[PDB]
């Protein structure tokens, strides 16, 4: 009697934490733009209270408003898009010091890109601008509002 973690409505609140996360420079799912990424991240639905590790989720079974998430392959590796609605907010975990995204002065929404190997291995990406929180590894906690289906 609970909505599982592999079920997202447009309007849910996602609470991702990133145990110690490294900076990427040229991430291809988000164009050619930088990112912080973690190996052992944890995705949380706030309104339902359902918590799950990112690497323990079959990401082909996750649906947004019933329909399946958008997938892209870049250099032979498959990335999954959970589109947000608004900019993704993130900050160093436990510290009030915050970070800001790549399109930090642009009226665009962000997404939440997930690499998935096929087994028990998955990465989680947050679109960033630079190393405003460090070059990594650094604990990051994110916050986003779940968005519409990509047309």
């Amino acid at each position, epitope marked *: 009697p609970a909505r599982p973690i592999t079920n997202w409505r447009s309007g849910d609140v996602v609470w991702v934490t990133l145990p110690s996360a*490294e*900076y990427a420079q*040229s991430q291809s799912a988000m164009g050619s733009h930088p990112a912080y990424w973690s190996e052992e991240a944890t995705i949380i639905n706030v309104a339902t209270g359902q918590r799950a590790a990112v690497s323990s989720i079959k990401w082909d079974q996750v649906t947004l408003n019933g329909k399946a998430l958008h997938k892209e392959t870049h250099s032979g590796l498959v990335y999954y898009q959970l589109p947000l609605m608004g900019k993704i907010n993130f900050w160093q975990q436990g510290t009030t010091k915050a970070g800001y995204t790549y399109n930090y002065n642009t009226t665009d929404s962000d997404s939440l890109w997930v690499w998935w190997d096929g087994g028990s291995k998955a990465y989680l990406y947050i679109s960033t601008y*630079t*190393t405003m929180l*460090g*070059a990594g590894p*650094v604990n990051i906690t994110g916050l986003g509002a779940v968005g519409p289906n990509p047309v």
Partner: antibody
Amino acid sequence: QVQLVQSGTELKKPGASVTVSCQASGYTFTRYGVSWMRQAPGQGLEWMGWISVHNGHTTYSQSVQGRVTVTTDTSTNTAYMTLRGLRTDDTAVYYCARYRGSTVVPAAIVFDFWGQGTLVTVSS
Amino acid sequence: VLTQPPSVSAAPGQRVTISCSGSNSNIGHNYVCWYHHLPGTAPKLLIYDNNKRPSGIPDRFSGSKSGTSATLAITGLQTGDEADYFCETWDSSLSAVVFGGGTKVTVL
């Protein structure tokens, strides 16, 4: 474990060209970058330049007058460094590091997982 | 250009403070790193992001940053810590990686 193993010591003449290798292991070589630093006898380290193995994008310093050239072999996971026009004061221990970070205005480069160094002597 | 004291010294068991001094384009807007280097060996990372240790670095080593200055603290100095210690940051004015000068540590 991540290791960087360089080439052996070399002895050149004033005006020759020295090529220093840097073998990599223990990590995905196309994920990170490789820099090159030197150490003159009696001084601290001086940065020379790097490369990014994702696409190939070198960025050298100004104190060297366009004499350095950094290339990579993707198949053998090995990065190179060719210094031409060897002046007498180019005698140094040339180090290899794993470049990682950003150079935009809040910047942070780490240079973790160095290599053991290579002495190059430019004399007669 | 990063400036360091050439030598810092303490008794076994005390603490040392190794400090750099850059400018607003070296350290005031960027994150500094501290390295450990025996002569004739490879340098080893100690502090990144001004205050953070990698795995396998003891709690004795701690760093900080205050404005355009940055200080490496080695609390509880023992034998085996006799090498050079030097900074690294990005200079947005020169568009280059600038290093310190290295600091000798002599155990009394």
